[PDB]
Design a protein around this ligand. Structure first.
Ligand SMILES: CCCCCCCCCCCCCCCCCC(=O)OC[C@H](COP(=O)([O-])OCC(O)COP(=O)([O-])OC[C@@H](COC(=O)CCCCCCCCCCCCCCCCC)OC(=O)CCCCCCCCCCCCCCCCC)OC(=O)CCCCCCCCCCCCCCCCC
Ligand SMILES: CCCCCCCCCCCCCCCCCC(=O)OC[C@H](COP(=O)([O-])OCC[N+](C)(C)C)OC(=O)CCCCCCCCCCCCCCCCC
Ligand SMILES: CCCCCCCCCCCCCC(=O)SCCNC(=O)CCNC(=O)[C@@H](O)C(C)(C)COP(=O)(O)O
Ligand code: SF4
Ligand code: SF4
Ligand SMILES: [Zn+2]
Lengths: 114, 113, 49, 178, 96, 208, 45, 99, 206
């Protein structure tokens, strides 16, 4: 049950790195919306960033948190230097994809998938 | 005479190849004396350096020296000698003569599964 | 000389496609006025030279 | 062994005649003039352009073109639904379904080749034990919709009936090598 | 032989035809459903039965290496011809 | 003698065995296994901590001179604890030889990058990270190199599906190229192409 | 029958040139400089 | 090949090469498109005796690699060696050493 | 084949070496002429692509595909050569060095090409070794290394050829190396045509 750390000895400085990454994303969102001609507002982009962080918010392993921070920094660099395009940025919103309903009756009416 | 070019890009001609090889080999031996006596790297590197120093003291001609050394050009031999010296410094820092750091898992190198 | 021989080959290529109408037909369809040995003709009307 | 492509051996020293030759080479653009002369020679050569579609580039009997399903001289289909072509198809471009026929013969009920998926490699025609599936030499079968390149058994049998006069001759010319 | 549906659509040699209420005939609307006219079952029915003398015959489909793998058909049943499993040719033993 | 069997020379096997003993006794701190294949190829399996010393020694030793890294790759064997086997093929032009150095990793233990030893390891380790998710310490710029921007998952892993999870198409409502969950008009038909009979008795594993 | 195969002729193939072959053409530098200078002098006169 | 002698001399002078000896257009020197049928030879294993497959099974002579040392199996004045003897220097070409 | 511990027959090995050298001529034609096209001259591209069309005819005559032959397989090659193919390969190769001489006349001594290629992208030998370069890059930087000479395969130890070595490590030296090894590939093609042996095509192991 004793493992080798990546960057963080425990969860506290891992959360510090998470807060730093969230700060960088929060600062970079308005520049992205201004630079790439995005239909979205600045509020929607920061909401999406918060949604992604809260999607990953359930993890408690410092190594997994460090790797998530590394991946987030890679995506942040891909957004800072314009390598992600408008399509790549708007892929986070899934606006063309209809969502599967979460209720048993709708899943029963649609098909056999649980 | 003097070699016009070494035939390799970026490898300048050494005017005095014998004394440069001599000082590189002596510095390598001097830093090899700081290794532990049971270090296999120390023993093997001392063997190699002593053989090359013996032939560089024996042969005064550059072409026959290259033929004896069998390391390409004498400038390549000088470059290999200084890389060996830097490796000796790094290996003294690393200390790899110690026992194995950690055993692998039982089926780590078992192929096929 | 050989220039007059080239001109002879040219005038026979011009007057070797039947008439003026045949020359114009082959020149505006195939963009080519070379004379070849008629190897055959298929049932659909294609000529092969 | 090895050789030098740009290393010069010794020196040519300096001479008044050699200096004047190099001066004339620099000033009068001699290598540029001979490059012009090379292009002029190519201008006065004969072009290598064929008159397509009235002239076609040469091919061989081994040429792998549009797929076809052949028959025996009796008219029975050669295919026996063995799915060796489907098994060896590297792109999984062949779909085969089969059942016994009304006379008990082992025949396909579905033979589809996705020509948009096929890589035109001939593995099907070299894995077929009865020479049923072949790549006949047709290559001018480009379509205007994606659907028309999704061949089924009717299309492949029609191709085999259309190109049998040429496919049989190519197999006759080729089969001793394979 | 090629037969037509009550819808008028040609029935393939596999017996496939769309139903009257099947919407997938719209792919043939203003186009054609191409059906191979030469039915191999009828064509192999048209072949005469080969009358041979031996009890066991060998078939390779003709042409040697251009045919099918060479198999052996046992013509012992006098009430039924022996059919080659590859090419569909029928053989019968001549007992006269 | 036999026209269908590869000729075998024992001198290369002897030389590679001697050099494997040489490297193993020079570096006992990191070397875990040394083997020579019947194809006359030398493999040295080391601890992940000794990647930098082992690669540096092989590049800069007078008797090794493996100055050229042929390639760097990973093999996903998802039945061991450390599923990613990192493989370094190296070429010595001085001695006209080739060596293979292996180490191991899992999804959460990064290994040291050898960009300071070979510069080709930059793009090679970028490819390894992009395709397997093996992080590399002290890399100058580690990021994806072959996948699409924003691609989620490492596709050369065994558990990653062949077709992936998303597919792209042009949507005219949004006038963009958009990603959808993958749907195939024809599913990839997997085949069970494994004979139920043992082919090679020399590789018969003992029963459990 | 006899084994028939794609083989070279029994006398071997002919020699195939592969070396770099530049024509080494053109007139001397003295002659062309003399022609140019003479053209200059005639034009000036 | 249908070029007049004037154009041939002009092309040869302009290129500096004798173009007519080596034409880049194929006229008649090529092989005929129809060939006599071949008869390919058989391999060395096409014999009716002394041809057991176990005596020529090269695929089953592969053995697992030999472990020179192991951390678990072995559980562990000589000269230093090299992976191979040093590569001999290439000789300069006697055909055309310089361009 | 190394994993299978089987060897292809000698005729298959000679065919593989011959087509490897034909392919080397194709690839170096593409490299040199498209490099010259990127610099600005396209007439060598057109001439050498007519030559590429003839070599594609050779590919189609042996395999049925002009590019993706799938001809060389583990155990040898897929089929034997059709009759007359060796004669047509000889007829192509006896005229090809003139075409190389044509491109070399067009480009090599041209001062524009020398300005575009000389002292451009200079790579030292140690840097090339550390960056992991191979083939034309190492030999352009001056490293005497070729796998066909050092670790030979098939019958490359039986053929004889020279290895072009640069001395300045630039675009001009790499271009000269590619042209000279095109000439050496032609030399190996001549040797393969003269020394093609009889025998089978695949390994006699079903
Ligand atoms: C000035 C030169 C004009 C061209 C000329 O005389 O070329 C002949 C000939 C061309 O030599 P070549 O390159 O060997 O000819 C190609 C084949 O050998 C021989 O070519 P081929 O055998 O394939 O067919 C040749 C045939 C081809 O015939 C045709 O194309 C007839 C077209 C009729 C259209 C109605 O006849 C000609 O080309 C005859 C010359 C036609 C010149 C037309 C000039 C005016 C063009 C229109 C202007 C408006 O010229 C010379 O030999 C000397 C040229 C300098 C003369 C001064
Ligand atoms: C102008 C020329 C146009 C092209 C003519 C045909 C090209 C082929 C000629 C043959 C060939 O390859 O020769 C190579 C040869 C060069 O071969 P070389 O490269 O081996 O050099 C010979 C050796 N040295 C270095 C000592 C000179 O060309 C010559 O000898 C002459 C080239 C220089 C003279 C022509 C260019 C300058 C002209 C200036 C005055 C203007 C003239 C009138 C123009 C009227 C119309 C506008
Ligand atoms: C324009 C749109 C572009 C959108 C781009 C989105 C970028 C996505 C970056 C994702 C980066 C991450 O996933 S790092 C977050 C994961 N880390 C963690 O969960 C650390 C542990 N989690 C926590 O402690 C969580 O409770 C919280 C909520 C993060 C912190 O809560 P505290 O209060 O207890
Ligand atoms: S040619 Fe190859 S890819 Fe195409 S159908 Fe045949 S086996 Fe499949
Ligand atoms: S390999 Fe031939 S006989 Fe077998 S299913 Fe395919 S086409 Fe039919
Ligand atoms: Zn039959």
């Amino acid at each position: 049950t004793s493992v080798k750390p990546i960057f963080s000895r425990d969860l506290n400085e891992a959360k510090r790195r998470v807060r730093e990454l969230y700060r960088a994303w929060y600062r970079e969102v308005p520049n992205t919306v201004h630079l790439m001609q995005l239909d979205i507002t600045v509020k929607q982009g920061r909401d999406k960033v918060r949604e992604m962080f809260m999607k990953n918010a359930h993890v408690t392993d410092p190594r997994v948190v460090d790797l998530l921070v590394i991946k987030g920094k890679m995506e942040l660099q891909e957004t800072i230097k314009v390598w992600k395009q408008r399509t790549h940025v708007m892929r986070f919103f899934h606006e063309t994809e209809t969502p599967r309903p979460k209720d048993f009756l709708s899943k029963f009416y649609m098909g056999h998938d649980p | 005479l003097l070699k016009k070019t070494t035939g390799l890009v970026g490898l300048a001609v050494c005017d005095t190849p014998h004394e440069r090889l001599t000082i590189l080999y002596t510095k390598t031996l001097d830093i090899l004396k700081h290794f532990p006596k049971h270090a296999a790297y120390r023993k093997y590197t001392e063997q190699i350096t002593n053989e090359k120093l013996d032939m560089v003291k024996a042969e005064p001609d550059v072409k026959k020296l290259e033929a004896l050394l069998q390391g390409g050009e004498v400038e390549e031999v000088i470059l290999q000698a200084e890389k060996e010296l830097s490796l000796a410094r790094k290996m003294l820092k690393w200390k790899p003569w110690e026992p194995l750091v950690e055993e692998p898992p039982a089926n780590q190198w078992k192929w096929p599964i | 000389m050989e220039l007059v021989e080239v001109l002879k080959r040219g005038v026979q290529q011009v007057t070797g496609h039947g008439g003026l109408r045949g020359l114009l037909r082959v020149f505006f369809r195939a963009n080519d006025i070379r004379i070849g040995t008629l190897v055959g003709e298929d049932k659909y009307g294609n000529k092969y030279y | 062994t090895y050789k030098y492509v740009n290393k010069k051996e010794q020196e040519s020293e300096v001479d008044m005649k050699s200096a004047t030759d190099n001066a004339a080479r620099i000033l009068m653009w001699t290598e540029l003039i001979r490059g012009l002369g090379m292009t002029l020679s190519y201008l006065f050569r004969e072009p290598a352009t064929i008159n397509y579609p009235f002239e076609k580039g040469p091919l061989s009997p081994r040429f792998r073109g549009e797929h076809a399903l052949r028959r025996y001289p009796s008219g029975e289909e050669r295919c026996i639904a063995c799915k060796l072509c489907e098994a060896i198809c590297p792109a999984q471009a062949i779909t085969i379904e089969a059942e016994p026929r009304a006379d008990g013969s082992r025949r396909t009920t579905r033979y589809d080749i996705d020509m948009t998926k096929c890589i035109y490699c001939g593995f099907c025609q070299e894995a077929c034990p009865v020479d049923a599936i072949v790549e006949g030499p047709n290559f001018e079968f480009s379509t205007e919709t994606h659907e028309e390149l999704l061949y089924n058994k009717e299309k492949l049998l029609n191709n085999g009936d259309k190109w049998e006069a040429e496919i049989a001759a190519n197999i006759q010319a080729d089969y001793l090598y394979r | 032989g090629v037969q037509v549906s009550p819808s008028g659509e040609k029935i393939t040699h596999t017996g496939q035809v769309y139903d009257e209420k099947d919407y997938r005939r719209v792919r043939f609307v203003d186009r054609q459903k191409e059906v191979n006219e030469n039915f191999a079952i009828d064509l192999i029915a048209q072949q005469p039965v080969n009358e041979v003398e031996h009890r066991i015959i060998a078939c390779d489909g003709g042409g040697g290496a251009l045919g099918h793998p060479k198999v052996y058909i046992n013509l012992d049943k006098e009430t039924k011809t022996g059919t080659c499993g590859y090419c569909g040719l029928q053989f019968k033993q001549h007992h006269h | 003698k036999r026209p269908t069997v590869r000729p075998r020379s024992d001198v290369t096997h002897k030389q590679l065995s001697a050099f494997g003993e040489y490297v193993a006794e020079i570096l006992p701190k990191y070397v875990q296994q040394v083997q020579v294949s019947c194809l006359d190829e030398l493999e040295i399996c080391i601890h992940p901590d000794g990647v930098i010393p082992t690669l540096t020694f092989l590049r800069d030793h007078t008797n090794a001179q493996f100055k050229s890294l042929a390639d760097l790759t990973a093999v996903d064997v998802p039945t061991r604890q450390n599923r990613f086997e990192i493989v370094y093929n190296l070429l010595s032009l001085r001695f006209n030889s080739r060596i293979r150095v292996k180490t191991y990793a899992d999804e959460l233990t990064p290994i040291d990058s050898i960009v300071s030893v070979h510069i080709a390891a930059n793009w090679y380790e970028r490819e390894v990270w992009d395709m397997f998710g093996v992080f590399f310490f002290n890399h100058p710029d580690l990021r994806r190199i072959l996948t699409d921007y924003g691609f989620e998952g490492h596709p050369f892993r065994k558990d990653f599906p062949l077709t992936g999870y998303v597919e792209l198409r042009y949507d005219d409502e949004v006038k963009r190229v958009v990603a959808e969950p993958v749907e195939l008009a024809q599913e990839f038909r997997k085949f069970d192409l494994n004979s139920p009979w043992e082919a090679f008795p020399a590789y018969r594993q003992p029963p459990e | 029958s006899k084994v028939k195969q794609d083989m070279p002729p029994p006398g071997g193939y002919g020699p195939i040139d592969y070396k770099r072959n530049l024509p080494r053409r053109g007139l001397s530098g003295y002659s062309m400089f003399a022609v140019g200078i003479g053209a200059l002098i005639f034009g000036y006169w | 090949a249908s070029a007049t002698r004037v154009i041939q001399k002009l092309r040869n002078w302009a290129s500096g090469q004798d173009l007519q000896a080596k034409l880049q257009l194929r006229y008649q020197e090529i092989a005929k498109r129809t060939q006599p049928p071949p008869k390919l030879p058989v391999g060395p294993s096409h014999k009716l005796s002394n041809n057991y497959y176990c005596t020529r099974d090269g695929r089953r002579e592969v053995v697992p690699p030999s472990i020179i040392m192991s951390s678990q199996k072995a559980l562990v004045e000589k000269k230093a060696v090299t992976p191979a003897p040093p590569m001999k220097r290439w000789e300069l070409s006697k055909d055309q050493p310089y361009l | 084949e190394k994993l299978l511990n089987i060897q292809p027959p000698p005729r298959a090995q000679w065919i593989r070496v011959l087509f490897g050298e034909i392919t080397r001529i194709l690839n170096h034609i593409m490299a040199v002429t498209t490099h010259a096209l990127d610099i600005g001259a396209m007439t060598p591209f057109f001439w050498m692509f007519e030559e590429r069309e003839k070599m594609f005819e050779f590919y189609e005559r042996v395999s049925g595909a002009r590019m993706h032959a799938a001809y060389i397989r583990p155990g040898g090659v897929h089929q034997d050569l059709p009759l007359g193919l060796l004669d047509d390969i000889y007829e192509f190769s006896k005229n090809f060095s003139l075409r190389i001489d044509e491109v070399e006349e067009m480009l090599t001594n041209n001062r524009i090409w020398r300005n575009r290629t000389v002292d451009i992208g200079v790579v030292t030998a140690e840097d090339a070794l550390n960056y992991g370069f191979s083939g034309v890059m190492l030999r352009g930087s001056g490293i005497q290394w070729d796998l066909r000479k050092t670790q030979p395969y098939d019958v490359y130890d039986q053929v004889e050829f020279d290895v072009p070595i640069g001395s300045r490590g630039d675009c001009y030296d790499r271009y000269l190396c590619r042209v000279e090894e095109m000439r050496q590939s032609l030399r190996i093609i001549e040797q393969c045509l003269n020394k093609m042996p009889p025998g089978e095509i695949k390994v006699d192991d079903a």
